[PDB]
Every structure is written in C-alpha cells, then in structure tokens.
Ligand binder design. Structure first.
Ligand SMILES: *[C@@H]1O[C@H](CO)[C@@H](O[C@@H]2O[C@H](CO)[C@@H](O)[C@H](O)[C@H]2NC(C)=O)[C@H](O)[C@H]1NC(C)=O
Ligand SMILES: *[C@@H]1O[C@H](CO)[C@@H](O[C@@H]2O[C@H](CO)[C@@H](O)[C@H](O)[C@H]2NC(C)=O)[C@H](O)[C@H]1NC(C)=O
Ligand SMILES: *[C@@H]1O[C@H](CO)[C@@H](O)[C@H](O)[C@H]1NC(C)=O
Ligand SMILES: O=C(O)c1cccc(O)c1
Ligand SMILES: [Fe+3]
Ligand SMILES: [Zn+2]
Ligand SMILES: [Zn+2]
Length: 341
C-alpha cells in the first residue's frame, strides 16, 4: 500500500478525479493530461499509477509493458449472484447505428457517407469498423471512405475531423477528450442524433442509455429507439433490440492498467475504493460514486457495477484475445512489435 495517482484525461475527468481524491482523503491523487496516449506516457514515466482503458489503448499500453489489472463489469445478462468481483466479464457489443429515416443506408452503401467515431484507436469507434472496411476494400485509403467524419484524434484539418465541433467556445476541435462535443460513446451517438453524421460506431449499451428518457440531456431527452436501426454485415438493417445478432464484433471490456511493478498495489487500493464508492458502496450514493458522471462516462463507463478481478493473470494479448490483436495489427500495417514511445 501507498497512495495511487490516477491519470485523468481532460478537465472534466480532472474535476471528477479531484473529487474522488478529496473523498478518499488523498488515498488516491490525480494527474491530468490531454489525451490517453499522454496518460499512458505519464504511467511509463512513473508519475501516474493507473487509468481505465478501452481495448484499443490497452493494445498501445501493452506493447509498452503496462498490464491489465481489473476489468469493468456491467449489469449481468442473466442471474449470476456469483460475485461481480469474481464473475467473468462478458465483452460488449460493437454496433453501427443509423437513423431509421435514412432509408437506403446499409453496410454496402456506406461509401461517401458521413460518420461519427468515439475516437481514433478505440475498439468500437475505430478499430472494429475500419478494420472491416479496409479488409473489404482491399485498400488502406481509409481516410477517403467517408466524405466527412468526426474521428477525434485525427488531423483537425483533415476529412476525419471535419464534423467535430470542439468545446463551448468552438475550441479544441477534434481532441480525443471530453472537451470535444462528439468524442466518446456519448459524443459519437450525439453526432448521429443531431444529424451531423449518417452513421455512428458505438457499443450496444450507448443506444439504450441515451434514449426513451434514460438521458435527461437536451439533445437526447426526445430520442426514441424505434427511430434508430443497426447495420449488419450481411447488408440488412435491424431494430436496436437485435444487437445479439446484428453487431460488428464483441469487444473486450475496458480495463484498468498499470505498470507491472505497481499492479498489485493498485489492485488492492481499487478493490478497497470500490467498497466505499462502487455500486452498493459505503459512501455511494450519499457522498460519492465512482461509476456515475451524469452519462459523461468520466474515468469509467457509467454502466459499471464493479471492477472484476481477471482470472488467469492474463497478459494484454490473452486479455484482448487472439482474434482482436491480429485485427489491430494488420489494420495498423496501413500506417507488429513496437512500443511507439
Ligand atoms: C444492450 O444494452 C442494454 C444496456 O446495457 C441491455 O439492457 C439492460 O440489460 C440488462 C440485462 O442484460 C437489463 O437488466 C436492463 O433492464 C437493461 N436495460 C435496458 C435499457 O434495457 C441489453 O441487454 C443489451 N443487449 C445486448 C445485446 O447485449
Ligand atoms: C482482416 O483480415 C485479416 C486477414 O484476413 C485478418 O487476419 C487473419 O485472421 C485470421 C483469423 O482471424 C488469422 O488466422 C490470420 O493470422 C490473420 N491473417 C494475418 C495476416 O494475420 C483480420 O483478422 C481481419 N480484420 C478484421 C477486422 O476482421
Ligand atoms: C485510505 O487508505 C487507508 C490505508 O488503507 C485506509 O486505512 C483508509 O481507510 C483509506 N481512507 C479512505 C478515505 O479511503
Ligand atoms: O471476448 C470476450 O468475450 C471478452 C470480454 C471481456 C473481456 C475479455 O478479455 C474478453
Ligand atoms: Fe470501448
Ligand atoms: Zn458475434
Ligand atoms: Zn496466461
């Protein structure tokens, strides 16, 4: 044991971390940086201990040595009262969502349309959908498939950042942090909701969480599921209730990673921290909840019930799985063994 420094990405997660910190009685402190790549860097340097990460990033971090420590576990499909902490994660569904009113749109007609991505390098928002698109077009010219996009983390002056909108003031356009309006699971679905884009690449959960009044935000409060459809790989369209059969891939749950050397200390600190701030936690809701950020998904997706332990003390390849790791490698051949820092 000792204090655990957490790395927050953006001023919003910075604000949330500071609060956790205050409430942990400086048991956990905070370090902020502008992007997840920067936070991976602070950790290698040793100035931060840990952060929660989407699989695509787990891949960046893993090549550099950081290991998965505990994974996100969302409300279980079935009646498993065998603990959340010990219950094996499920993997979330990666889907492609469109407006039902955009009638002729299918997977086979996405060329030249407008797209919304969570962020470059993420599983559902990028790696899954673009990996498939390169594969099918036998061409790495993926910066030219759609006519415009909001893919946070791309070049602000390129096609890919053309639909992004930055912050309140119109600044920080296309930055891969919550300051960019259309970044993340919620930011990319808002991009589609507002009709800035024709298609959004998010997880199944996102569609459900920002519709039928589950979100009281202004852009989403009037959104209904029937007004959306999913794009399957066979070319048909399906309601948002048929995710099970109409998804692009199943995705490894986001997971907390730290440097191998500090992984055990972080593991112990987090299990104790979720005991006071997790779901059914001691100080949640009363004082502070780690898994709540008014649907903004700050430091942890809002639908997390707990951070589970990983059975098999897996490496980042075993945790990300063999299927996915070769998908990310080939896709990345368009721009197989190196830590880029
Ligand atoms: C798609 O996402 C939603 C959101 O997480 C899932 O529905 C929740 O599912 C749990 C059980 O799996 C239920 O107890 C909740 O009542 C559901 N909430 C809503 C809004 O329905 C749904 O299970 C997911 N479906 C797939 C394909 O995984
Ligand atoms: C895109 O295609 C490549 C090549 O088909 C896939 O990589 C192959 O995947 C198979 C089984 O998944 C492996 O046995 C081979 O080792 C892979 N080939 C190579 C060159 O590594 C990749 O999985 C595909 N991407 C997506 C997103 O489906
Ligand atoms: C912080 O950690 C110390 C050492 O484990 C523990 O005794 C204490 O309960 C923790 N305090 C808070 C607020 O989490
Ligand atoms: O393939 C998955 O089912 C899966 C889902 C979650 C975590 C994980 O390592 C794997
Ligand atoms: Fe993700
Ligand atoms: Zn499947
Ligand atoms: Zn192993």
């Amino acid at each position: 044991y000792t204090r655990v420094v957490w790395c927050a990405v953006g001023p919003e997660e910075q604000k949330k971390c500071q609060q956790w910190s205050q409430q942990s009685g400086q048991n956990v402190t905070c370090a902020t940086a502008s992007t997840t790549d920067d936070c991976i860097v602070l950790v290698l340097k040793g100035e931060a201990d840990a952060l929660n990460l989407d699989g695509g990033y787990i891949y960046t971090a893993g090549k550099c040595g950081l290991v998965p420590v505990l994974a996100e576990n969302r409300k279980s499909s079935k009646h498993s009262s065998l603990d959340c902490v010990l219950r094996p994660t499920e993997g979330y569904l990666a889907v492609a969502v469109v407006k039902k009113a955009n009638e002729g749109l299918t997977w086979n007609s996405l060329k030249d349309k407008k797209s919304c991505h969570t962020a470059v390098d993420r599983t559902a928002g990028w790696n899954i959908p673009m990996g498939l698109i390169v594969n099918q077009t036998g061409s790495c010219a993926f910066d030219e498939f759609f006519s415009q996009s909001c893919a946070p983390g791309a070049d602000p002056k390129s096609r890919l950042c053309a639909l992004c909108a930055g912050d309140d003031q119109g600044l920080d356009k296309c930055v891969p942090n919550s300051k960019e309006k259309y970044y993340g699971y919620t930011g990319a679905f808002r991009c589609l909701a507002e009709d800035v884009g024709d298609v959004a690449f998010v997880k199944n959960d996102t569609v459900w969480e920002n519709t039928n009044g589950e979100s009281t935000a202004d852009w989403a409060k009037n959104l209904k599921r029937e007004d959306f459809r999913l794009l399957c790989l066979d070319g048909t369209r399906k309601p948002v209730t048929e995710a099970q059969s109409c998804h692009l891939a199943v995705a490894p749950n986001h997971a907390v990673v730290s440097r191998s050397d500090r992984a055990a200390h972080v593991e112990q600190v987090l299990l104790h921290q979720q005991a006071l701030f997790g779901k059914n936690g001691k100080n949640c809701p009363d004082k502070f909840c780690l898994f709540k950020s008014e649907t903004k998904n700050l430091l942890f997706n809002d639908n997390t019930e707990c951070l589970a332990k990983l059975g098999g003390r897996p490496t980042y390849e075993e945790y990300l799985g063999t299927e996915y790791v070769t998908a990310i490698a080939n896709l990345k051949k368009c721009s197989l063994e190196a830590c880029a820092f």
